[PDB]
Amino acid sequence: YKKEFAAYTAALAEAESKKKQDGYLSEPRSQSLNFKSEPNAIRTIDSSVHQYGQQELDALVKSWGISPTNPDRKKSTAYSYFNAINSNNTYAKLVLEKDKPVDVTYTGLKNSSFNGKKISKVVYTYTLKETGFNDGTKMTMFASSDPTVTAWYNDYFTSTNINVKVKFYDEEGQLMNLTGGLVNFSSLNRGNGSGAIDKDAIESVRNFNGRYIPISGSSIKIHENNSAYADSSNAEKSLGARWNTSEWDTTSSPNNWYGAIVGEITQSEISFNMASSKSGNIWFAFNSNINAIGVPTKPVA
């Protein structure tokens, strides 16, 4: 009733008091966005886009030199990583062409809402912008059955930069403005690379068209062109990390804020770039499951 609004006001007061403590939002906020888990969404991609078979894509990537037979350990390691993600056939398997957008549309959302209004549909647009691999023209990614799990992409241990647009729609098919809703940019690993290639792999979010809220104590810092990443290893204590990757980078760790930053939405069309260097495989989840401590849910009406 108002029991809630009182608890909301109390938690917000505590959040301002504990601003500077590890894991708290540096600026207190509440959460109006509920976009947490959608395991039974319907995924649709336009017939113009080729959704690859497992063997088909395997042969194609091998044809580019990313093969288990390649004498260059970088390329055979690139393959090994690629094979692991290509083995999950619940993903839609895509080859992105540079500057050619691809929409992945999720419908029949069951669990999601913004400020009491049901979210029925979310559309992701993926556009490869740059890659260090071969002639810079193509790269593989994998679109999840669940829009909150979202995507894996590759860089074949070079680098990749993919723009993502996100648009959410209500029951009436209208574009929703989720301004003020909070999104989780999580698991932004640095230093978790292949020791055979380069441990200093870097996962980042670039060109975010919202406003980041730094999490106090987090390894993830903001940089020019609204780009969030760590400045040194958050993977190994022996290279300065507070925790080894396995101690913080899970959905269940109380330390998982250590590799995270919060994004506050400011536009109906959300935009950011997923970017990696020397990572092989990158899991990029986009959801409202913020890792920060003491963020109350904003009550409705």
Binding-site positions for Ca(2+) read 187, 189, 203
- Site map (CB under 5 A) of Mg ion, residues 145-184, x = contact: ----------------------------------------
Whole-number Å distance between alpha carbons of 17 and 213: 16
* Closest CB 174 distance from Mg ion, rounded Å: 33
Instruction: Considering the complex, state which of residue 61 and residue 151 has its C-beta at the smaller distance from Mg ion.
Output: 151
The one segment of 31-39, 154-162, 188-196, 229-237 that binds Mg ion by CB under 5 A: 188-196
Binding residue numbers: 187, 189, 203
Cβ closest to Mg ion, residue 52 vs residue 229: 229
Residue 34 lies near Mg ion (rule: CB under 5 A): no
Backbone φ and ψ for 258, nearest 5 degrees, come out as -60, -30
* 54-63 and 73-86 helices, crossing angle to 10°: 170
Q: Pick from 184, 187, 219, 289: which binds Mg ion (CB under 5 A)?
A: 187
The overall longest dimension of the chain from CA atoms, in Å, is 67
287: which strand partners? 184
- Cα–Cα distance list, 116 to 10, 34, 67, 111 (Å): 21, 9, 50, 11
Q: Which is nearer to Mg ion, 90 or 250 (CB)?
A: 250
Q: Which residues inside 193-232 make contact with Mg ion, applying CB under 5 A? A: 203
Phi, psi for residue 257 in degrees, rounded to 5: -55, -25
How many residues sit in the footprint of Mg ion (CB under 5 A)?
3
- Spatial separation of the C-alpha atoms in residues 203 and 245, rounded to whole Å: 13
Site residues for Mg ion, window 43-102 (CB under 5 A)? none
Distance (Å, whole) CA 180 – CA 192: 32
189 touching Mg ion, by CB under 5 A: yes
CB nearest Mg ion: which residue?
187
By CB under 5 A, name the binding residues for Mg ion. Answer: 187, 189, 203
